[PDB]
Structures are given as C-alpha cells and as structure tokens.
Amino acid sequence: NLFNVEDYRKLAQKRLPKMVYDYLEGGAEDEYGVKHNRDVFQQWRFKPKRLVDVSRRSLQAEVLGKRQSMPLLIGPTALNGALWPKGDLALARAATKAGIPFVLSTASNMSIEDLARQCDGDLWFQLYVIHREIAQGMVLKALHTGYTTLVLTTDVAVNGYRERDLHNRFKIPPFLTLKNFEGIDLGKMDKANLEMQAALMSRQMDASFNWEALRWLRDLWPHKLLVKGLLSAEDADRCIAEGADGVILSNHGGRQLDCAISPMEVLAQSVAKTGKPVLIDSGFRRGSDIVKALALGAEAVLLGRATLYGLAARGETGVDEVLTLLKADIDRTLAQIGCPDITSLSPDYLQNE
Amino acid sequence: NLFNVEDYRKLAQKRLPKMVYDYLEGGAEDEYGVKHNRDVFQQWRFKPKRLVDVSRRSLQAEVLGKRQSMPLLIGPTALNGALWPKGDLALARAATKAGIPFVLSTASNMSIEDLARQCDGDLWFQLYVIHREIAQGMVLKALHTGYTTLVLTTDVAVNGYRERDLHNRFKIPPFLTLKNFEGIDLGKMDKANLEMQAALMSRQMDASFNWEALRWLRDLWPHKLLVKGLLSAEDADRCIAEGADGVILSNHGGRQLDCAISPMEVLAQSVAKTGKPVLIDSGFRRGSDIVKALALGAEAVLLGRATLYGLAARGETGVDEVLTLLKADIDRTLAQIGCPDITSLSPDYLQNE
Amino acid sequence: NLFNVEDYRKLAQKRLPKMVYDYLEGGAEDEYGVKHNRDVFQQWRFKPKRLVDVSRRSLQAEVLGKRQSMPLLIGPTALNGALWPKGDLALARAATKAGIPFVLSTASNMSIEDLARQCDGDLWFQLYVIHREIAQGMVLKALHTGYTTLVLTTDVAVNGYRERDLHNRFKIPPFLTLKNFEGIDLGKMDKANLEMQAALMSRQMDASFNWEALRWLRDLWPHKLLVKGLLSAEDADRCIAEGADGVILSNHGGRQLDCAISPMEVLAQSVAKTGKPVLIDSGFRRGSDIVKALALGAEAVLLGRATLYGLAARGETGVDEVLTLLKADIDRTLAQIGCPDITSLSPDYLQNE
Amino acid sequence: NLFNVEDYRKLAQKRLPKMVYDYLEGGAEDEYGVKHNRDVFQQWRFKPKRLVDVSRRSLQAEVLGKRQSMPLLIGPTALNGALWPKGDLALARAATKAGIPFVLSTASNMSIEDLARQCDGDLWFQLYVIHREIAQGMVLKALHTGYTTLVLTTDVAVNGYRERDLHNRFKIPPFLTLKNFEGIDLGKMDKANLEMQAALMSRQMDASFNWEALRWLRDLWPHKLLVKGLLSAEDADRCIAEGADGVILSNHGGRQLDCAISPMEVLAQSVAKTGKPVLIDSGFRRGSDIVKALALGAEAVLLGRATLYGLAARGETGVDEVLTLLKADIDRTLAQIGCPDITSLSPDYLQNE
Ligand SMILES: Cc1cc2nc3c(=O)[nH]c(=O)nc-3n(C[C@H](O)[C@H](O)[C@H](O)COP(=O)(O)O)c2cc1C
Ligand SMILES: Cc1cc2nc3c(=O)[nH]c(=O)nc-3n(C[C@H](O)[C@H](O)[C@H](O)COP(=O)(O)O)c2cc1C
Ligand SMILES: Cc1cc2nc3c(=O)[nH]c(=O)nc-3n(C[C@H](O)[C@H](O)[C@H](O)COP(=O)(O)O)c2cc1C
Ligand SMILES: Cc1cc2nc3c(=O)[nH]c(=O)nc-3n(C[C@H](O)[C@H](O)[C@H](O)COP(=O)(O)O)c2cc1C
Ligand SMILES: CCCCCC[C@H](O)C(=O)O
C-alpha cells in the first residue's frame, strides 16, 4: 500500500536500524530547516489552464543541453551502502533505467571506477575537497572513466551539527568504507605527503576553498561544471561569472544550517539574474513540489531522501518504484494544470499564497 | 442533535461503510486541498450594517435570469446511489422541494430520462466527454427530456490521485452502474464504433477537449451553457468569449489537484472581468461561507458534500433537512449583517483578514 | 489560587451546571468568533517608555464627561440570576464599590426599580426593543428611577445560532423570569394591546428598528444615549449624526455572528471618524487587553464574561475580586509601559504585530 | 547526552525543586512573552555566502571598546545561589574562563566585594535603585572594588506579575539573602535614616527614577555606563543623549510585561538611530539566535537562562559547558554562512521571513 514517497519513508523506518534511519532522516539542530523545506511549497498554489489539449504529454526535457526522460536526477548522497547493499549501484541503475542522471558522492561506498564499469547511464560526480591534490586525483579519475558532469559541493566547509547522530554516537557501519579514498597511498614520508594523511584522518574538509580555487577546478575539468550549495542569486551569478555552466540551489536537505533559507526562496531571482541553468533540491517529495520549482524556472530537481526511501525500503526495485510514482505524479500534475509539455511551464500557472 | 452540516457528516460516517465514506469525503493526495477550501473562508469577516430594517428578508434570487427560492444548487456528483438508495432522485426531489436546481452527473446511477420522468423541478445536466459521439447522444437526450441547463466539467482531463480510494482498492458498488452509458450499442464492428468501446472501457476521458471543442458543444446546445472547473479569471473570460452563458469556479472539492487554489481566490476578479454570471463551489459548509461568496459577486453556490451528508445519513428527508438548515442559516446571516435582500450583498459587508 | 480572570472561569465551570455554564461561555456556531475576539489582542505588543516617574499612578478617568475610578464598566448581560442568586444586584454592588457603572439588561432577573432602590451607584439601562410601546415604558421607568445612561443594543435583530444551548435544549431556569416584562398588563382585548402579547410570547425582537426609530428614542431619552453593537466606523459616525452621545463597538462577545470582525478591528478608525466617545467590549480578559484598547482611543471597556466568572464562582465577593485583580492588573500595566496617568495612553505605546 | 542549552534545561528541571525551577523558568502572566521571545528569531533565515575561505575564524570582538573572546556576556540575574551553591561565583568564574564579562545583580547572594575579591575577570555591576542613598553606596562600593561597567536596569518600576511564583507562594530560600543590602546600618532613628528602612522592607523599588535621576547617576559613575531594559529606538537614543555609553535592549526575559515586544523588534532601528553600542538579551538559546542579532547590529548578547541552566544542572562546570557549546555553536554558524570574522556580520547574511 506504497502510493507515494511518504509510504516509502514509513516502510524504510520499519526496516532500517534506528541509528541508520536517523542518519538518513536527520537534520541540523532543532530541525526547523527540514520542516521549512517542506512548508515553503505551501506558498504556491496552482491556477490550472482549462480546455487545453493534454492527451499527449511530454516530460522530456533538456538539462545542460542534454535531453533526458524527465527534469529529475538522483542527487549525490553519502553512505548509500548503509541504507541497502550496494546502494550506490542500485540507485545508479534505477536512474539509468528511468532515463535520468545519477550523481556519485565523493563519500560513496562504491568507487568512481566500479560504478562507471557496472553502469552505462549518465553519471555525474560530486566532489568534496579535503586535500587539493587528492581532489585532482578523483577529478581525473572520473574524467577518464567517462563521467559527463562534475559537481562541486560547497555547503560543508565544516560539518553540520546533527544531534540525532550525536545522541546515537553514530558510527560509519564497519562493513562499509569511503571507497574513493581507499588506496590513496601512504608510506610516503615526504612532508607534502604527510600533509595529506592529516586531512585523510579528518572528517573535516578544506574550509579554505574560495573562488580562486574554483578557477583552478574550472581549468582542470573540461566538461559541464556545476556548483552545488548556493543560497543566493548573487552567489549563483558569481559562479557563472567564474566559469560554472550552472548551479544547484540547495541547503543540503536541511542538514547543514538549520536556519538556512529554502533554495525555493531565491530560485526565481537566481534564474532571472544568472540567465544560466539553475537546478535545485532540498525538500522535494511530491510531484507538485517538483512542478512548482520547474514552473519557477528551475532546469531540473535533484532527489535526495525521496529515492533513498525507496532504496532503504526495497533496494533497486524500491528506487524504480519511487521514480515511477514521481514520474506519474509529475505527469498527472501537468495534465491537471493544462501544461502538456513540461518545457512550457511558467510562473503563469502559480499563485503565491 | 442535527443542527448543521457537520452533524450530518458525523452521522453519515456512522452509517456509511468506510470504503464509501472515504470515496465521498476523500480528497487528492495529502488533502491540503480540502483543508485549504475550508480555511480560505477565514480570510473574510463580517462588518454588519446596524439599524437596518430586516423584519422582511428575501433569499429569492435570479440565477442565469431565472428566479429561484435561494442562490443555491445541488451540484453534480457521481455515484449518489452508493450513498443512499436512488440517491440521485432523493436529491433532485429535495432540490425541487427547496425551489432550487439539481444537476445530474454524467456518471449518475439513474438515467437522464428516468429522472426527467420522475421529477419536475429545474434539472441541469453535467457533461463529461469520454467519446465525442457519445457526448452528443446524452446532450440531445437531455435536451429532449427538458433539461434547462448544460454544464461542461473540465477539471477531469485525467483522474485525480485520491489515495483513500487507493488504500481501499475502492470499487464501484456491484448493485450500481453508470446508467447514462447503459445501452450505448455494441456488436458494431465498424471501426468508428470500436473506437468507442475502447473509451467506454476507459475510466479516462477525452484529455483532448479544447476551446474549439467548446464551440462544437456551444452550437449543439441551444439553452444556457456553463463551464465548470475554472480557476482563473482569464479562463472564465475566455469561456464567455467562446459563447458560455456563465462559468463555475471550482477545484472539484479538492479531489483533483491537491495544490489547486480555492475558487474563492479568483472569484472577485472573475466577476469583474467576465461581467457575466460567476457561480462557485468547493468548500461550502456554512451559511456564512455561502454569504461571503455571494457578497463577493458570485451568482450562486453549488453544494457538493454538504447535501450528500444529509443524503448518506437520512436519505431524501436528510437532504431536505440540510437545505432547510442552510436556508435558515443564510437567512439568519443576512439579518445579522443587515442585508435583508440577498441581492443587495456587496463586498461592503466584508473585511479581508 | 485565584490570580486572574481565567482562574475564575475554571472555578465557575466547577460550580455551575453544564447547561448554565454553556449558556454563559457559549458562542455562535463554530465559535471562531470568541476565539478571534481573544486572538486579536496579539496583533499589538507594548513598547514601554522607560525612565518615566510612575511612583504616582492614576486610573481615574472620565466616561461621557463623568469621572469614575477607572475606564471600566460591568456590561449588560441577561439572566445573571441564573449564574448566582440575585446576580444582578451582586454585580451592581461590586461595580458601585469599585467606583464604576453597572448596566442593567432589558432581560434582567431583577427589575429596573428594585435595583435602583437597592443600589446607589451609577446605573445604566440597556434597552432591547420587542414592542415599541413596551420599550417606552421601560425607558421612562428607568428615567424616573434615576438611571443616568441609556444603551440601545442593536446586534440582536434575530437570535444568534448558539449550538451549545441547542444541544442542551437550554431553558430559562424555572425560579427565574424576565422581571422587566412582568406585569405588562393583559386582559386588554383591544387590537393594539394584543399586538403586544404576540411580541411578549416571542423571543424575537423588532428586526424593524432603523435609524428613524433611533430618532424617536433620542427624543424620548433626555440623558446620555449610547448605541451598542456597532462594527464599523461608518455606523458609529451615523449614530453620532443621529444624536447618540457615543457608541459601543461590540460583536456581542461572539454570541451573535460567528464570523463577525472584532470591534478592535475598527476601533482606531471609529475614534478618528466620530470624534466622540467610543466605548468597547468583546474578548477582554486581561488588563493588557483593556490597556491596548484604551491606548487605541477607546473611552472605556465594558466587561461581559470576565466579571460573570467572579459572580458565578463566588457571587458578589467574587465580582469584587475580579474587579480588584483587573484594577491591579491595569495599574501594573501602566507602570510597566511608563504611562502613569491612564488618560495619557496613546497608540505611541503600541506595536502592530 | 548534553549537546545544547535545551538539554541543560531538561537536566536542570530534573535537579531543581519545582519552586526554584518555576522561579527560574517562569514568565509574566500567560507567558506569551517568553514564547514570543523565542518565536521572533524565526522571522530571519540565513543566506550563506559560499566559496569564502573560512579555515581561520575569529569570534574575538570589542564590546564598549574592550576586546573579549566573543560577543557574549553572562547577564545579571538575581538569586543565583538558589540555583546552585555560590552560583554567583560559579558563573563569574565560567565567564572569566571563557574570556567574557559577568554582570553581578544588585540582588545577588554574594556581595559586590566578595566576588571582586574571589574573581579577577571583567566584572560589571547591575544596579537596581530602591533607596537613592543606598544606591550610591553600592555604586561607589563597586567603583572601589574595580568593577569596569555599571548597568542601570529600568524595567522593574514595579514587580512583574509572575503567576508560577504566585501559585507556589514562592519564598526566597532561607539559607540565602540579598547580601548587597546586608549591613546597611539601622538603629539610626533620624528620619532620613528611617525613610530607608521602609524601602529596605519593600520588594518595591523607586518607580520615581527618571531621566534627571539618570544624570545624577551619570555624574556619579566615571566608567562605562549602560542602560538596560529599553524597548524603543527613541529611548535608547535618549539614553545616549543623557550620557549613556550604550544600552541594553531587553524585556527582562519575558518576566516583566507579558505583551512586551521582543528587543529584536527594535534592534536594527536602535542601532541606526543611536550610532552607539546596542547590546541585547531576552530569548537567546541558540548560536543562530545570537548570530542573527549580531548580524543586525548588536554589539553583544547577554545570556540569562541559558547559562543558568548549566549552573542549575552542573554548577560551574555546567556553565563552562554551556559556554563551550555556545562558542562552538557560534563558530560553526559563521563557518556555514561564510563570515569568518564575527565582526564582519551584516544584515546581508539575513532574509526576513
Ligand atoms: C543521508 C544523506 C547524505 C548526503 N550526502 C551528500 C554528499 O555526499 N554530497 C553532497 O553534495 N550532498 C549530500 N547530501 C545532500 C543531497 O545531495 C541533497 O542536497 C539533499 O538531500 C536534498 O534534500 P532532500 O533530501 O529533502 O531531497 C546528503 C543528504 C542526505 C539526506
Ligand atoms: C463524491 C463526489 C462525486 C463527484 N462527482 C462529480 C461529477 O460526476 N461531475 C462533476 O462535474 N463534479 C463532480 N464532483 C464535484 C462537485 O460537483 C463539486 O464541485 C464539489 O463537491 C464541490 O465541493 P464541496 O464538496 O466541498 O462542496 C464530485 C464531488 C464529490 C465529493
Ligand atoms: C450570558 C451573556 C448574556 C448577555 N446578555 C446581554 C443583554 O441582555 N444585553 C446586551 O446588550 N448584551 C448582552 N450580552 C453581551 C454583553 O453585553 C457584552 O457585549 C459581551 O459579553 C462582551 O464580551 P465578553 O463576554 O468577551 O466580555 C451578553 C453576553 C453574555 C456572555
Ligand atoms: C531568574 C532570573 C533572575 C533575574 N534577575 C535580574 C536582576 O537581578 N537584574 C537585572 O537587571 N535583570 C535580571 N533578570 C533579567 C536578565 O538579566 C535577562 O534580561 C534575561 O534573563 C534575558 O532573557 P533570557 O533569560 O531568555 O536570556 C533576571 C532573569 C531571570 C530568568
Ligand atoms: C555533517 C558532516 C557531514 C559529512 C558528509 C557529508 C554528507 O553531505 C552528509 O550530510 O552526511
């Protein structure tokens, strides 16, 4: 009796150990962030356009100039192998089966190569920078394995204060590890090489990464480059000014800064100012949420917890199911508001409440 | 201890099987739509005009130029025979006894003819278009049986995602059927005739019906024609531009698109722009709700669930009772705000909150 | 452990029979009116003026040109003898002991004369008009007994739909009666005289009373005349235009029209437009409520349920106690905001929220 | 499992006697004041500035021209010895260990001298004026003992109506006393000297203290002088006009006037109008609360209940812990919004909701 994302959340809570479930569902501090992420969608209602022929609908759209089955993506999330065996691959395959991209996390349980070898869909790589030299290693590693897009996540200068993990003394499941860091040499006692082991033993990343460093990364990567974690039209504009091909408005699903605004709050403005692809995530659970954002100008929406619920509850097939429902949900929504072609969405179909 | 519509809802929930009750009370998805439909009335409070002579009040009004006992109507609802034996007729008779119109649903359990034969009140016919040729059949059928008004419902291009029915695996009660489709030939193996049986086995309607198709219908029907399911002043204006004699602002009682705006949100504007009769429904339970809408310019309010509660709880007499209370409620309200003649209502008696 | 009005409400609910308690506490329909009456005070917060000498405070003020101990009044309420033995007199005496006026209801359990004989404080008479000739009888009766002010209540054209009384089949306690109507002749079979007995058997009043009738009353009464039940600056202005010496903004404590605006919503405007005394009631329970209204321009606040709780809980002494707390409450409030003289209150001490 | 201020509140409620806990946690009347104090922070969300180097952060700041480890202070609170043995000293020591000031209350359980002798951190003295001559005594007493700043609290002209203490018949713990008043002579039968004993037996202070009296105090004290308890930009401006070196916007933690606005409501304005140091308190529990205020222009935030929870729960170490968490909290917050130097905060990082 699995008819929406919520049903999968309930089912996942019943199958996951509290510690893992809390890792997944948890937010920062009081968790007003995740609640706000959901609430913000209620500030917009639909004003359907009647008597429009909607017998032939199309959810097909172009993201960064490349066509995909629908304006969605399974976003980068760490420790998927803790939610389900080989979670990273189960997701990549459901994404590929659905015709949409999958973004591998820097902190995945499967390596940039193992996935690229066991999957042929559109693969994106999300990069976290702990050590500058190590970052370049993964970047080229992903470049050689055929990853089409690179995504720099910037909202984790320091770790977010997530108390559920604190009360649970959460620990990365033993049978799992951060594969992308495995084999990163050692024994090399030079200094430089030592100044890397210190960062590898630090769950703390380079809080130093600035715009200048973005240029370094821009030159290093030849394909589409997106900056994730932006919460202002000003910052998205700067990113485009610095070479980015697009940005991802996001507050990390309310896991980093509890009082962070919802990316929906600066979406229309970012779209107007950048004049470039503005993707988004954080709070999306319903097809109506996704449509309101697409209607506001977003190029595509990335899914975080939504698809993870399908994974944690029923593995790969569970992810296929969540994507199938969401597509049908999105489809049904366009039909109701009278916008047969997903690419014709505009603020015209919305009403601010 | 039945003093308002709510009391009848409670009583109906106690008499109806959960499955049927959920079919009736249910809304789309999270059901924020039905809650919003109710909440929206709280955005307006009354500013009574004191020391006005209200010893002689009149609820009599003209709808589409024809006078009726009060600005109300029992709106078109499907499967009434599932709420109570011969529900369609029980309703038509309470409406006729109250001096207001009754709108027969395309998906009624009694046929366009049986009703027209067993009832002599003002009968309206709500049309759903599954098959163009079949639609014309009912249209003429209703025209010949003496139905005064035709109502094209446009907010069901595709079926609304109603999860209560999904969790219940709801099925149209065996002893009941969609009478208006009964006898629609068969055996005719021509192609055209086959391209109809496919639509008759589809709970899916012509998502193709556009403005051009509205013209076809406008020429086909010689009497008052109304378009139901509009949620924008722009669409109501277009309908009038295309021949409609009036429109029905409505979001289908929150059963089609959960995040749909309440028709109350575009009522004043639709009235100002169309300059034609603007009727409305969705959320009305109190006489105060009805009065606020009438005060905003609505020509009349159609009742959906309100009267269905009286029917499901106590059949025909139950409907008489709900109408009697609502009339008294409306009457008492005009007296309190100092507007003795229901036709003198204006935005003047309201205060936006 | 009786430190505020609420404590007395709780105590009264424990001593009163549910039927009587519901008669007292009840509101119209859903009772969103009484809740709104309370909520509306939260739209204003205090902006205290520091370093002001408040060692010598004065709550003394002039109402309609006559000085009283504080800007309060025990308002007219029907059936006080049902809340406590000789409730009307218990109240009049607490009011007189507190140095503020008491308004006798047309529907009191003690007569206009018995009170005027057993009490020497400032007595006001609230008039309800069932029969024009009978009204004049009480008016002169009160004039001869020495009542200083007359109050015409206009918000009861018809009776408010109060469902608590309906579910309880509420009936006026046997041992009690509407004394002011006792002895109003009979046996007189003339027609005119018969056209009075019909009104005396009707819990329904003259819904016909209009502005013209207000003139008749204005000429009939030589002293201060106030019109109670107004909810618009326009109506208060008209009343002054017609001779009234002041008005009482009120929605009858949410007992007549559930969706009625709170008189607080039109207080500032009524004060600005009338340029005459604007009194008010409906929802007042805290000294802060009273002060916000006085700060907005109100000349005085009338108490309804607040003092009735003291009466129902502990009779006369209970009323003395509620008044004592409210005075101390008001006093403490002026001290906190830095307005030592109650007559210096202005919108300056408020902040709209 | 003590990760935030709230955890300490819970722990303190478990260790404190209800009577003492209620004294601490209680507010005035309905306690909408303390709730509002918390709610008001939700009117602002963060708009982080990405790709900023935050690897080297600084919480160091100047308060009244003097540098301290962070923009915080343990504010003046009465009866600390009732929450924990020698609470005043436990607090002063945690403040001094944290590198921030401590403000001794006029009504402390340890004297102005005992503390100045047992502690060497930055000590401030909060003054309450019961008797003008007695006030001067403490003022000079604090001046000679080396207190750097004097703070005149003005929001206690009369005592706030706190019902928790009323229902509990709260009484100052026997083993404790108001040390700063101990030894204030007696036996002196002159008149003047008698006109002091009357004030010493009065939990009531000089409601007479006005601006003129502020001048007297301004001349008397040679160092930094701050006025606490202001709730308007106008009053803060007057204070500066009268000699104050800065002000403390505050509503006494919702303990004096329940409907008092939150100082956050007039913070930006007070900063713009005074052009002088504007400190603040009332409602602060999270680092995000503190940062929003600092971002709005506040020079520093004083802690009331937050640190008292650490004290009541675990004494001195408990206070060290609350301060340690709050510093880390503040630190983590600057990192997330991209403002490495606490002194660079501006309204730029905020979004009004
Ligand atoms: C368990 C979990 C792990 C995450 N790991 C990463 C990560 O490794 N890299 C990254 O850029 N974002 C990470 N995110 C953030 C997501 O990419 C995405 O922004 C967020 O989940 C969107 O919100 P939603 O979950 O409400 O859809 C994570 C989120 C969750 C819930
Ligand atoms: C059980 C049920 C069946 C319905 N069937 C129909 C139908 O056959 N045709 C149509 O035009 N609208 C249909 N509607 C919508 C109603 O005509 C009306 O717009 C709606 O009920 C108004 O909202 P309310 O129920 O809050 O009054 C139906 C509504 C309900 C609750
Ligand atoms: C039990 C009860 C009886 C009342 N009877 C009368 C009446 O006889 N005449 C009148 O003018 N108003 C009458 N009122 C209205 C009050 O005068 C007053 O407007 C109202 O109580 C104000 O609201 P509050 O109760 O919240 O203070 C009555 C109110 C209550 C609660
Ligand atoms: C138990 C308690 C005692 C207090 N005593 C004093 C005092 O002696 N002098 C003073 O100026 N303020 C006093 N205050 C007010 C505080 O200095 C401060 O303004 C307030 O606690 C700020 O709110 P918060 O508790 O939410 O942080 C007291 C507050 C509490 C909770
Ligand atoms: C708060 C520390 C987070 C460390 C890994 C980043 C990932 O985005 C996650 O939210 O779990």
Ligand SMILES: CCCCCC[C@H](O)C(=O)O
């Ligand atoms: C969602 C499918 C609805 C099929 C019949 C239309 C009717 O309006 C109803 O809401 O039940």
Ligand SMILES: CCCCCC[C@H](O)C(=O)O
């Ligand atoms: C609703 C009928 C009211 C009849 C008496 C008036 C009085 O104000 C009351 O509210 O009880």
Ligand SMILES: CCCCCC[C@H](O)C(=O)O
């Ligand atoms: C309400 C009486 C307060 C007397 C001492 C002042 C102190 O600020 C406190 O709030 O306890």
